[PDB]
Design a protein around this ligand. Structure first.
Ligand SMILES: CC(C)[C@H](N)C(=O)O
Length: 248
């Protein structure tokens, strides 16, 4: 509508709407992370509460920690749950034919960021998505150095398929999407946005000028669109819509 009063009413309404929906996608990402963190923390506590005797031989680690890894893996349908040791071995509970957790020596764990970085923080470390070597799926890893009496036991890892987060984001209302820490498209409600040749520089450029949660105007094929983005951990969450709501 031409009258500026009416246009402003449309603009303020749609800003609120789109900001709400962006928030839902932000919350989705947050809740995914915090659920996985809480799970990892719980597992750390159960391992560290074992007596040392149960932790200080490899056979005892297999027999006493293995079942805990397995139950926890099942409870959340994780892809892998594991404990890496300073001798380079990793006690691995992996999806797929119910075979018992095994101590693997061939996974080059001291070269891995999930291992290395866990020893450099007292927090849980969360990797970018990457191709798991074991099961050959893209995963987000949550890792945690486990200490008992101050003494390192090993580095706990939990691999959750990145597709789980992609699927949760896709389900949300609104034309929302998520870029990874290299500004590559990661997840979207509209699956077309995942074409790697799509040009996201208008939205990313507008975000760069405007900042988190600040609604902007931009152009596509000479038509006006409206959007907003915000940082959510190392991701960028955005929403966009046509400006026809305000212009027409
Ligand atoms: C060790 C394995 C389970 C881990 N996902 C990795 O690829 O390093």
């Amino acid at each position: 509508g031409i009258d500026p009063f009416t246009k402003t009413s449309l603009y303020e309404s749609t800003l609120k709407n789109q900001t709400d929906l962006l928030k839902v996608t932000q919350s989705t990402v947050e809740d995914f992370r915090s659920t996985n963190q809480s799970f990892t923390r719980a597992l750390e506590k159960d391992i560290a509460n074992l007596p040392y005797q149960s932790l200080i031989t490899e056979e005892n680690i297999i027999n006493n920690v293995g079942p805990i890894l397995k139950y926890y893996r099942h409870s959340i349908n994780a892809l892998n749950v594991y404990l890496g040791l300073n001798n380079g071995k990793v006690l691995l509970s992996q999806k797929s034919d119910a075979k018992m957790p095994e101590l693997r020596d061939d996974l080059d764990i001291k070269t891995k960021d999930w291992y290395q970085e866990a020893l450099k923080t007292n927090d849980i470390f969360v990797t970018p998505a990457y191709l798991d070597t074991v099961l050959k799926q893209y995963v987000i890893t949550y890792s945690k150095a486990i200490y008992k009496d101050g003494k390192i036991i090993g580095v706990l890892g939990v691999d959750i398929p990145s597709e789980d987060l992609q699927n949760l984001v896709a389900k949300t209302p609104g034309n929302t999407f998520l870029f990874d820490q290299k500004n590559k498209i990661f997840a979207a409600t509209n699956k077309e946005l995942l074409n790697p040749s799509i040009d996201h520089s208008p939205v990313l450029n507008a975000y760069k000028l405007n900042g988190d949660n600040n609604f902007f105007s931009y152009k596509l094929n000479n038509e006006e669109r409206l959007g907003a983005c915000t940082k959510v951990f190392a991701y960028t969450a955005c929403i966009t819509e046509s400006a026809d709501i305000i212009n027409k």
